[PDB]
Design an enzyme around this catalytic site. Sequence first.
Site, PDB file in Angstrom:
ATOM      1  N   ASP A 154       0.509  -1.235  -0.197  1.00  0.00           N
ATOM      2  CA  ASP A 154      -0.004   0.002   0.016  1.00  0.00           C
ATOM      3  C   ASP A 154       0.895   1.078  -0.202  1.00  0.00           C
ATOM      4  OD1 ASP A 154      -2.576   1.619   1.394  1.00  0.00           O
ATOM      5  OD2 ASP A 154      -3.585   0.033   0.840  1.00  0.00           O
TER       6      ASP A 154
ATOM      7  N   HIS B 207      -3.771   5.421   3.841  1.00  0.00           N
ATOM      8  CA  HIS B 207      -4.570   4.957   3.136  1.00  0.00           C
ATOM      9  C   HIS B 207      -3.949   3.833   3.769  1.00  0.00           C
ATOM     10  CE1 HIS B 207      -5.774   2.375   0.230  1.00  0.00           C
ATOM     11  NE2 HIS B 207      -7.148   2.451  -0.044  1.00  0.00           N
TER      12      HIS B 207
ATOM     13  N   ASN C 252     -13.917  -0.714  -5.813  1.00  0.00           N
ATOM     14  CA  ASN C 252     -15.227   0.838  -5.813  1.00  0.00           C
ATOM     15  C   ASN C 252     -15.186   1.065  -7.261  1.00  0.00           C
ATOM     16  OD1 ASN C 252     -13.975   0.354  -3.273  1.00  0.00           O
ATOM     17  ND2 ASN C 252     -12.631   1.758  -3.563  1.00  0.00           N
TER      18      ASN C 252
ATOM     19  N   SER D 201     -10.841  -0.982  -0.061  1.00  0.00           N
ATOM     20  CA  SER D 201      -9.345  -1.343   0.426  1.00  0.00           C
ATOM     21  C   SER D 201      -9.936  -1.420   2.361  1.00  0.00           C
ATOM     22  CB  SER D 201      -8.875   0.472   0.897  1.00  0.00           C
ATOM     23  OG  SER D 201      -8.649   0.349  -0.408  1.00  0.00           O
TER      24      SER D 201
END
Length: 279
Positions: free
Chosen positions: A39, A69, A161, A224
């Site tokens: 990530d 994130h 998404n 996520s």
Amino acid sequence: AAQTNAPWGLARISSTSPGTSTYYYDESAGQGSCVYVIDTGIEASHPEFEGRAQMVKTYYYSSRDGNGHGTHCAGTVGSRTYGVAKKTQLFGVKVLDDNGSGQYSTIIAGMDFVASDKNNRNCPKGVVASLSLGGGYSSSVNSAAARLQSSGVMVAVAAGNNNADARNYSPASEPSVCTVGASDRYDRRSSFSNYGSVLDIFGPGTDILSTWIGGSTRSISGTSMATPHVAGLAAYLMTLGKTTAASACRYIADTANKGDLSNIPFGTVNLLAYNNYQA
Ligand SMILES: Cc1nc(N)sc1-c1nccn1C
């Protein structure tokens, strides 16, 4: 063990019903397992990680998470308050820049890094990788995820998404990894969650409280956020000896809460990750 006033998603993964707020789990808590969070990095100094998180690789000028994130996802895997597997070891691999973007070539390198790097780590109960990232279909990205899985790592990836069929996204569309959709606290498919035959499982993904950079916390939404619930669950179940990296996705699907989600399109699994812990 019982964690009162837990984030709804933790309570959900140990419950046969929505609408409760205590997370119940075996005290082994993923001890002896490891989870790689591939990530934007991890703020390992966050008190919520208790010294169990570390950065092991970056492709950029810093290994620090300048975005948040990756820290949020790592917190859902394994932070003391916000995590599924509260005693796992967390390893950060920074393939995404501080704007959250990354080239597929760097992402592929990061997956192959994990497949090798696990041989430099102590993970007697097993190894998981959480990939809260993706873009358009790429056979090379899918093959990298398949290699990582084949090497003995439980790979969990975000469905995406786009409110669309995940077959057009990578690594979501790779059949051999665990593709995770998102649900909300009322057991509805999250409005943004991708769907389709390639999904293996849903996890909590709307309004998920976790760690953030600057030693903070915040609630955000996405596939996520669902992915690290499943990655942490896998680490927890592997520590318990109930499954292995090669079979953990199928075990999670087999033991899931079934048929309880709404707004699941015909042809997508109706399966919600569940630890089956009996206190
Ligand atoms: C994606 C989706 N969510 C529902 N509750 S129904 C549905 C659907 N079936 C066929 C097409 N679409 C767009």
